[PDB]
Amino acid sequence: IESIIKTATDTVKSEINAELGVVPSLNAVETGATSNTEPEEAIQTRTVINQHGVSETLVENFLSRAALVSKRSFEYKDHTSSTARADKNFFKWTINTRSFVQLRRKLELFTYLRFDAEITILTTVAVNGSGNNTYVGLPDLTLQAMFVPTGALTPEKQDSFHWQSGSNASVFFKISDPPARITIPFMCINSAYSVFYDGFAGFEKNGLYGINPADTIGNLCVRIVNEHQPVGFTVTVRVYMKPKHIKAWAPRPPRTLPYMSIANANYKGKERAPNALSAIIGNRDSVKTMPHNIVN
Amino acid sequence: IESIIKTATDTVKSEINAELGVVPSLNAVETGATSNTEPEEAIQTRTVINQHGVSETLVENFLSRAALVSKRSFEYKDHTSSTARADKNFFKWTINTRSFVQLRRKLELFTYLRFDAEITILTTVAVNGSGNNTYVGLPDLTLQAMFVPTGALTPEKQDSFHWQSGSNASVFFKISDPPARITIPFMCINSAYSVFYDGFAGFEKNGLYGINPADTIGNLCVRIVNEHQPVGFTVTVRVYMKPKHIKAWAPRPPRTLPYMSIANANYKGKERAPNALSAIIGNRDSVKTMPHNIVN
Amino acid sequence: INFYKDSYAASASKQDFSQDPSKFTEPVVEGLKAGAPVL
Amino acid sequence: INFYKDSYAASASKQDFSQDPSKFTEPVVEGLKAGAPVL
Amino acid sequence: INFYKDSYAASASKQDFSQDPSKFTEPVVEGLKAGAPVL
Amino acid sequence: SDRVLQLKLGNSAIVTQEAANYCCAYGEWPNYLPDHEAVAIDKPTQPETATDRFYTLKSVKWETGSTGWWWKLPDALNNIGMFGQNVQHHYLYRSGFLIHVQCNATKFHQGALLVVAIPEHQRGAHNTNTSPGFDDIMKGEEGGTFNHPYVLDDGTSLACATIFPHQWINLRTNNSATIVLPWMNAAPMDFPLRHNQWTLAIIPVVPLGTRTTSSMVPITVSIAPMCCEFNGLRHAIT
Amino acid sequence: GVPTYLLPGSGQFLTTDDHSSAPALPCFNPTPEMHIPGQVRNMLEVVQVESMMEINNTESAVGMERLKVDISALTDVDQLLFNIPLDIQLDGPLRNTLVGNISRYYTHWSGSLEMTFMFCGSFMAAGKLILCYTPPGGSCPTTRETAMLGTHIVWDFGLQSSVTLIIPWISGSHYRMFNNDAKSTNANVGYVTCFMQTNLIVPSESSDTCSLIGFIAAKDDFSLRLMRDSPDIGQLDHLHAAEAAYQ
Amino acid sequence: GVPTYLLPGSGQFLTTDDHSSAPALPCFNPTPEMHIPGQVRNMLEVVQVESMMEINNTESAVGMERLKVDISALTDVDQLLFNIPLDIQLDGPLRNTLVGNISRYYTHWSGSLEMTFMFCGSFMAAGKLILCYTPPGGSCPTTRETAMLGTHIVWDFGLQSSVTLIIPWISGSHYRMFNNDAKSTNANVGYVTCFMQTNLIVPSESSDTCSLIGFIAAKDDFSLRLMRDSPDIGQLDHLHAAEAAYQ
Amino acid sequence: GVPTYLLPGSGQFLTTDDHSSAPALPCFNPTPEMHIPGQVRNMLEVVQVE
Amino acid sequence: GTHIVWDFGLQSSVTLIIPWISGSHYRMFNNDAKSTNANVGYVTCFMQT
């Protein structure tokens, strides 16, 4: 039944029981219900007034933490002789929560999630080695982070006119300023994000499995506004996400085997236990062997 | 008896006393009580209205001061050819209050303590000598301080994935910003920290004596977020602790002999007085010798 | 402190202390009484 | 000034002026009256 | 604006407009009337 | 009035005709653990008179060069009678104590013993960085002796030991000391085999002296647990 | 204007901070809420659901075989069948459970647990077992006459196929800690043991070896503190296709 | 927004500052409070407990022998036995006391003190002493007829084994200072002296030398100001195993 | 939080400014006031003495 | 067992009470000293200091 729970439940003292027809310790697992055997019915207890709070396990508290979701390093320099695949003073990132495993596993503890997302961008800069074998100092550069909806037109170069950002939300920030922060609303076309999706997002048979683009927040396009300096630098941008105003539905078995890809739940497991395909828990000598037995 | 004391007690005027059976100046130390002889009963006094405040000796005021608890210097550079024991752009510190003696002695004036801990982190940087015999300037670096519970997984390298900090509290701060500050709650599994512990924290006989890990706040893992510069620097991080919301129980004899270790109360004493094992107070010629006698 | 015009900009909401574990622990049409045999 | 949601984040509390020195100075079951011999 | 807990931390107090020059100008036991000879 | 005292607990009784009041540590009295402070949920056993009674330890001899003696609680009582059996069969223990220290001599003798109950007397070693071992600390009924009573074997001062609950046995004045100790711990209950809440220390601040014919002058300790309760019944481990 | 001064900690980015921040999409209207079954508002709801213990965590036990314990008919009385360590911080039979997995995101834990055993033999199979919880302090009991001195329940096989042993919260401190020192006085919970009370007796037509399945859950007196990164997941490199998100 | 401007002192870290700061662990529930005996809320409670003076702070007095003063039978009248300097800032008999140790964490002090002497001779020992407090200004008295002119108490040995000499607060200023100039007019308290009033008289069977133990405490008119680092502790290097905390 | 912006003159040290500032010694109790003869509260009192 | 610690002093006499601790309502004055219906137990005196 629904009730407001702020502290752990109290224990009431209990006496001897010798009653026919009453077996609180016996249960029927086959029904799918969890055993209702209380400590008062299993042993003789005292009275305990429990003042232990339960607020730290609140779903909001459990998930509302800034977790690293993106890390991208790129060279800030003249990119005339750079390869096509290189990030020429700017990068684009399709936003996802599946690249860093701690937050991914925490989110995947649930089937459905609804939250707004606080986004924090932290920038660091270093002077390139083997480009100029000397140090002069770190410039205070200005960066532009533009939100572009998934599939929409992204900038093709650092000085592209697409950065004019007529309607796209853009944030300009300096390396010397505190990390930039913006709140993105819950943007799913459905009432909740689908953490897991058992289907195909296309009307033909060649669409991606387990991927619902309605659950992709969008694209983040980050550029250095400053034109290049005579010497080269390496700029690393870290994007952190913190869910807030969270609602969660249908908890799931936690991930055990290591993640393989950000696109699927494919599994291989470790070579040996723990967290191997044939053995999740580490082995002991026998079911009669106590691993950390106290011996005096 | 319990009473609210804000100022020192007043003195009342007194007259001559020649009463049989009344000896206020005589006491019995053997009972363990402190003498109750008032100045009014020992001499003839005047009336004095005492307005002297007592607030500066309040336990809260006595202990709620930012005291240095940790100081760690490490090189910020390319650590490819560095030794294993060296701090390669990051360090880990098991939090304790026993390394710097002023705060340690103040805390050890009590048997039990309960407080939240304000933590302030101050960073300084210098250009390495004998590495590059020149000065170019001081970079404005970003540092990450991650709280890791005692015994839990700590990062093994500067760019380790463990720094992603899915659930661990992490603070990012710049050298140019004011010193970072966070409040850690009273985290002991008991109702109070045990400043002294007369026991062993293990169920076998080889556990550490006098160490209760329930009284260890945790581990602080500090890294430079920036990748290394072409030249080397020396970065010094100082951690200061200030107890607050303090409750104190069972005051103790103050430490006299110099501390030897942060792990025990082992003592050796100075070679000679003062604060020597066989003589705490410095010597005088005789019990009839006045050390600083006024002679005119 | 929220001076923004959009409600989703607000800080987190850690006040929802309502629980219903029985939707996971006892999802049976016929409730099970303590002491009485389940079957 | 405390805009944080956790009470332990607050500044120090230097208002507790209550004292009871007798728990250290006179921890005897039978109180000692002034002037009267202790024994 | 004073959010500090110690009163001596407050800004200056330039409101004390009370004066008594006679403690320096006329410190005589017998006051001197205008016009009347002093001696 | 304040010189004679009878202490009666369980089937045991002690009389003294030369007491000097008696001390209640920090003005408190022992009591059972109340429900609003309880942690362990199993019903505790409260043996009452079977365990809350005076146990007398082996007497020690006051000598001219004696440095002092100490006993640790509950360790000293952990193998004595029904208290010892309950301790050995239960994971958790809780109680206070009533300590009575006895030492008599003639009116021609002089001497002064500080009888102090030290909470959490974490001992230190002398002239080494190695922490004291298990055998150095856990002495049982026999107890131990002070290596350097001047610094209480912990780098502190004997002169300031009076901050702790204490009495004095001054031979010209009294022949016994009595201290009542409540439960003193950060936790409501504790494992009795690994932690010692209290340490009784008897230190001869003024050495024993006389010019009559010498006689053995022993010091005897009687400790009565109070409001004993135990939790976590299982097989005996000792 | 307003005279101000910046405190220590100004400009810092604390991951656990709680502040309002600028809305990037003004006047955005989120999709209307729809009722969805199985909402969870406190993780303590999850830990109360019993999940299967991996008691048979031994070599030669592969996959699903690790989740059941085989019992056969014995020709000696009062024999030990198995034991379960009770540390929900180290690797062991309790780790890969709902309570274990959720609790390992935290450092401190308190409250009672419940272990439910379902007998999965034939209808004709009969037997009595004894399940004992031993509070810590000594070695794990290896004989029935020692284990029966602690908390225990005698289980008689019958129409009710499942029994529950309650591991009550018996601790000196308000909380225990999920520290790596398994033998610490603030960590060790004690042991669980299972002994033959009479025997497993089956007819010739039934299988002579019968399996038990063990589940564990937390009661509603259970609570957790001091959240921490779970040791149960980690990465040493970027996942596959993670780079493609930048292309 | 709000127009503001930063004051001098913005961004500084003052160790004695008092501000709220960000909670690193949101929604953490601290362990419930438990009543613990011997709570202390003001350090002035500690200084009121008498602790032993080290009057016998001389060479050849080793350890515990420094905490007692020996008195023997004399064959000349009105003889001096010992004196006590009264500076609780410099090294001396009062330094390693509860009042001395706590006060040395401060710079200013005020209020009356009490010195309690316990005679620890045999029951048969008899004697009368005189304890004198001399307010400052001149040399420490060396004869009884000079010391008796100041504050004093005549102590008769008997069933009550202890006497108290009150050192009342006699000072030109509201406070005295714990400065290193022992002869300053704002520091010097005066002297304490002990003289034979009649003699120590014992029978042949009793010990001919009897010890006194001196204690000192502060009364409840005592107060301290201007907290400072205690000179009684210091380090020139890192303590042992301090480095291991970083490994 | 509160949106703000720094005015011209922010961070400057003006010798004639009048602001509160951090107390270096918390809970310090100053010596009680004593009546002292010849208090002066306005320098115009001094200039009136010939 | 049951005991009293006796301190010599102005009160020159101490009393040890041997309380009636018996399984049966009465004991018997029979010649079998070791019978369960006869034996009362023992009294001992030890040096305390």
PDB file of C-alpha atoms in Angstrom, chain A residues 34-164:
ATOM      1  CA  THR A  34       8.371 -12.038  -1.331  1.00  0.00           C
ATOM      2  CA  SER A  35       8.273 -13.651   2.114  1.00  0.00           C
ATOM      3  CA  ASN A  36       6.361 -11.631   4.707  1.00  0.00           C
ATOM      4  CA  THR A  37       8.025 -13.275   7.720  1.00  0.00           C
ATOM      5  CA  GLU A  38       8.695 -10.569  10.284  1.00  0.00           C
ATOM      6  CA  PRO A  39      11.569 -10.690  12.798  1.00  0.00           C
ATOM      7  CA  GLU A  40       8.944 -10.617  15.557  1.00  0.00           C
ATOM      8  CA  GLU A  41       7.587 -13.943  14.267  1.00  0.00           C
ATOM      9  CA  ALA A  42      10.955 -15.666  13.717  1.00  0.00           C
ATOM     10  CA  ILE A  43      12.711 -14.854  17.015  1.00  0.00           C
ATOM     11  CA  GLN A  44      11.934 -13.159  20.314  1.00  0.00           C
ATOM     12  CA  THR A  45      12.707  -9.464  19.843  1.00  0.00           C
ATOM     13  CA  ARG A  46      12.966  -6.386  22.021  1.00  0.00           C
ATOM     14  CA  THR A  47      11.369  -3.008  21.355  1.00  0.00           C
ATOM     15  CA  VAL A  48      13.510  -0.768  19.132  1.00  0.00           C
ATOM     16  CA  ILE A  49      12.554   2.759  18.067  1.00  0.00           C
ATOM     17  CA  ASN A  50      14.327   3.131  14.724  1.00  0.00           C
ATOM     18  CA  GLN A  51      15.345   6.694  13.822  1.00  0.00           C
ATOM     19  CA  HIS A  52      17.426   5.764  10.749  1.00  0.00           C
ATOM     20  CA  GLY A  53      16.606   8.024   7.818  1.00  0.00           C
ATOM     21  CA  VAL A  54      15.941   6.703   4.320  1.00  0.00           C
ATOM     22  CA  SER A  55      16.432   9.907   2.320  1.00  0.00           C
ATOM     23  CA  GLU A  56      19.809   9.003   0.786  1.00  0.00           C
ATOM     24  CA  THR A  57      18.223   6.101  -1.132  1.00  0.00           C
ATOM     25  CA  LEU A  58      15.530   8.316  -2.670  1.00  0.00           C
ATOM     26  CA  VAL A  59      15.484   7.833  -6.441  1.00  0.00           C
ATOM     27  CA  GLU A  60      16.030  11.572  -6.929  1.00  0.00           C
ATOM     28  CA  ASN A  61      19.094  11.513  -4.672  1.00  0.00           C
ATOM     29  CA  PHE A  62      20.249   8.219  -6.201  1.00  0.00           C
ATOM     30  CA  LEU A  63      20.321   9.617  -9.746  1.00  0.00           C
ATOM     31  CA  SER A  64      20.686  13.417  -9.299  1.00  0.00           C
ATOM     32  CA  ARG A  65      24.476  13.543  -9.433  1.00  0.00           C
ATOM     33  CA  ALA A  66      26.714  15.123 -12.064  1.00  0.00           C
ATOM     34  CA  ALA A  67      28.222  12.198 -13.979  1.00  0.00           C
ATOM     35  CA  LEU A  68      30.731  12.474 -16.810  1.00  0.00           C
ATOM     36  CA  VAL A  69      29.053  11.774 -20.145  1.00  0.00           C
ATOM     37  CA  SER A  70      31.524  13.116 -22.725  1.00  0.00           C
ATOM     38  CA  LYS A  71      35.261  13.769 -23.011  1.00  0.00           C
ATOM     39  CA  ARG A  72      36.780  15.121 -26.226  1.00  0.00           C
ATOM     40  CA  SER A  73      40.320  16.382 -26.829  1.00  0.00           C
ATOM     41  CA  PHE A  74      41.233  18.206 -30.031  1.00  0.00           C
ATOM     42  CA  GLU A  75      44.032  20.390 -31.362  1.00  0.00           C
ATOM     43  CA  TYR A  76      43.627  24.176 -31.476  1.00  0.00           C
ATOM     44  CA  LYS A  77      45.970  25.316 -34.251  1.00  0.00           C
ATOM     45  CA  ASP A  78      46.181  25.965 -37.989  1.00  0.00           C
ATOM     46  CA  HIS A  79      44.538  22.902 -39.565  1.00  0.00           C
ATOM     47  CA  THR A  80      45.414  23.496 -43.230  1.00  0.00           C
ATOM     48  CA  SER A  81      47.503  20.298 -43.434  1.00  0.00           C
ATOM     49  CA  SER A  82      45.210  18.252 -41.170  1.00  0.00           C
ATOM     50  CA  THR A  83      43.447  15.026 -42.074  1.00  0.00           C
ATOM     51  CA  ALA A  84      39.735  14.975 -42.860  1.00  0.00           C
ATOM     52  CA  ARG A  85      38.837  12.934 -39.769  1.00  0.00           C
ATOM     53  CA  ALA A  86      40.629  15.344 -37.419  1.00  0.00           C
ATOM     54  CA  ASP A  87      38.670  17.858 -35.353  1.00  0.00           C
ATOM     55  CA  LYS A  88      39.739  21.175 -36.904  1.00  0.00           C
ATOM     56  CA  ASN A  89      39.244  23.532 -33.933  1.00  0.00           C
ATOM     57  CA  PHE A  90      35.744  22.133 -33.303  1.00  0.00           C
ATOM     58  CA  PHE A  91      33.900  18.880 -32.713  1.00  0.00           C
ATOM     59  CA  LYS A  92      30.373  17.494 -32.810  1.00  0.00           C
ATOM     60  CA  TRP A  93      28.987  14.903 -30.392  1.00  0.00           C
ATOM     61  CA  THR A  94      25.738  12.974 -30.594  1.00  0.00           C
ATOM     62  CA  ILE A  95      24.545  13.146 -26.994  1.00  0.00           C
ATOM     63  CA  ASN A  96      24.242   9.767 -25.290  1.00  0.00           C
ATOM     64  CA  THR A  97      24.466   8.341 -21.776  1.00  0.00           C
ATOM     65  CA  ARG A  98      26.052   5.010 -22.733  1.00  0.00           C
ATOM     66  CA  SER A  99      29.767   5.822 -23.119  1.00  0.00           C
ATOM     67  CA  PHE A 100      30.777   6.007 -19.434  1.00  0.00           C
ATOM     68  CA  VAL A 101      29.692   2.913 -17.593  1.00  0.00           C
ATOM     69  CA  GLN A 102      28.939   4.102 -14.037  1.00  0.00           C
ATOM     70  CA  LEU A 103      26.108   6.433 -15.049  1.00  0.00           C
ATOM     71  CA  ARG A 104      25.010   4.011 -17.774  1.00  0.00           C
ATOM     72  CA  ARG A 105      24.588   1.127 -15.316  1.00  0.00           C
ATOM     73  CA  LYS A 106      22.826   3.375 -12.791  1.00  0.00           C
ATOM     74  CA  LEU A 107      20.348   4.533 -15.450  1.00  0.00           C
ATOM     75  CA  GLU A 108      19.905   0.972 -16.739  1.00  0.00           C
ATOM     76  CA  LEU A 109      18.775  -0.083 -13.270  1.00  0.00           C
ATOM     77  CA  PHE A 110      15.408   1.213 -14.567  1.00  0.00           C
ATOM     78  CA  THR A 111      13.216   0.587 -17.599  1.00  0.00           C
ATOM     79  CA  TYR A 112      11.662   4.056 -17.966  1.00  0.00           C
ATOM     80  CA  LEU A 113      13.008   7.442 -16.865  1.00  0.00           C
ATOM     81  CA  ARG A 114      11.725  11.023 -16.999  1.00  0.00           C
ATOM     82  CA  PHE A 115      14.069  13.852 -16.036  1.00  0.00           C
ATOM     83  CA  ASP A 116      15.412  17.246 -16.953  1.00  0.00           C
ATOM     84  CA  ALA A 117      19.183  17.276 -17.479  1.00  0.00           C
ATOM     85  CA  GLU A 118      21.600  19.765 -15.948  1.00  0.00           C
ATOM     86  CA  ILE A 119      24.648  20.005 -18.224  1.00  0.00           C
ATOM     87  CA  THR A 120      28.063  21.240 -17.089  1.00  0.00           C
ATOM     88  CA  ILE A 121      30.933  21.886 -19.506  1.00  0.00           C
ATOM     89  CA  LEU A 122      34.494  22.028 -18.159  1.00  0.00           C
ATOM     90  CA  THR A 123      37.385  22.995 -20.437  1.00  0.00           C
ATOM     91  CA  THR A 124      41.121  22.454 -19.961  1.00  0.00           C
ATOM     92  CA  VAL A 125      44.040  23.445 -22.183  1.00  0.00           C
ATOM     93  CA  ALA A 126      47.653  22.314 -22.533  1.00  0.00           C
ATOM     94  CA  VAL A 127      50.539  23.421 -24.739  1.00  0.00           C
ATOM     95  CA  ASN A 128      51.307  20.904 -27.476  1.00  0.00           C
ATOM     96  CA  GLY A 129      54.439  18.793 -27.169  1.00  0.00           C
ATOM     97  CA  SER A 130      56.571  17.947 -30.221  1.00  0.00           C
ATOM     98  CA  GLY A 131      54.793  20.799 -31.987  1.00  0.00           C
ATOM     99  CA  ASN A 132      56.608  23.521 -30.060  1.00  0.00           C
ATOM    100  CA  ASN A 133      58.991  22.141 -27.415  1.00  0.00           C
ATOM    101  CA  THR A 134      58.454  25.166 -25.184  1.00  0.00           C
ATOM    102  CA  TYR A 135      55.900  26.688 -22.821  1.00  0.00           C
ATOM    103  CA  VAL A 136      54.725  30.303 -22.992  1.00  0.00           C
ATOM    104  CA  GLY A 137      51.416  30.125 -21.143  1.00  0.00           C
ATOM    105  CA  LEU A 138      47.784  29.122 -21.482  1.00  0.00           C
ATOM    106  CA  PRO A 139      45.428  31.426 -23.418  1.00  0.00           C
ATOM    107  CA  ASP A 140      42.016  32.379 -22.048  1.00  0.00           C
ATOM    108  CA  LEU A 141      39.961  31.174 -25.001  1.00  0.00           C
ATOM    109  CA  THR A 142      36.261  31.620 -25.728  1.00  0.00           C
ATOM    110  CA  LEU A 143      34.225  28.558 -26.708  1.00  0.00           C
ATOM    111  CA  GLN A 144      30.773  28.236 -28.258  1.00  0.00           C
ATOM    112  CA  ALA A 145      28.572  25.228 -27.472  1.00  0.00           C
ATOM    113  CA  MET A 146      25.548  25.038 -29.786  1.00  0.00           C
ATOM    114  CA  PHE A 147      22.673  22.601 -29.320  1.00  0.00           C
ATOM    115  CA  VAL A 148      21.555  21.119 -32.651  1.00  0.00           C
ATOM    116  CA  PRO A 149      18.594  18.690 -32.771  1.00  0.00           C
ATOM    117  CA  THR A 150      19.425  15.125 -33.782  1.00  0.00           C
ATOM    118  CA  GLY A 151      19.798  14.889 -37.549  1.00  0.00           C
ATOM    119  CA  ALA A 152      19.739  18.651 -38.154  1.00  0.00           C
ATOM    120  CA  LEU A 153      22.404  20.724 -39.901  1.00  0.00           C
ATOM    121  CA  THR A 154      25.684  20.746 -37.984  1.00  0.00           C
ATOM    122  CA  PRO A 155      28.588  23.126 -38.693  1.00  0.00           C
ATOM    123  CA  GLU A 156      31.158  21.840 -41.177  1.00  0.00           C
ATOM    124  CA  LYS A 157      34.094  24.070 -40.154  1.00  0.00           C
ATOM    125  CA  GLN A 158      35.259  26.333 -37.338  1.00  0.00           C
ATOM    126  CA  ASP A 159      34.222  29.588 -39.059  1.00  0.00           C
ATOM    127  CA  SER A 160      31.070  28.199 -40.692  1.00  0.00           C
ATOM    128  CA  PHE A 161      28.071  30.510 -40.978  1.00  0.00           C
ATOM    129  CA  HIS A 162      26.002  27.817 -39.226  1.00  0.00           C
ATOM    130  CA  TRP A 163      27.493  29.081 -35.943  1.00  0.00           C
ATOM    131  CA  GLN A 164      25.466  32.304 -36.295  1.00  0.00           C
TER     132      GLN A 164
END
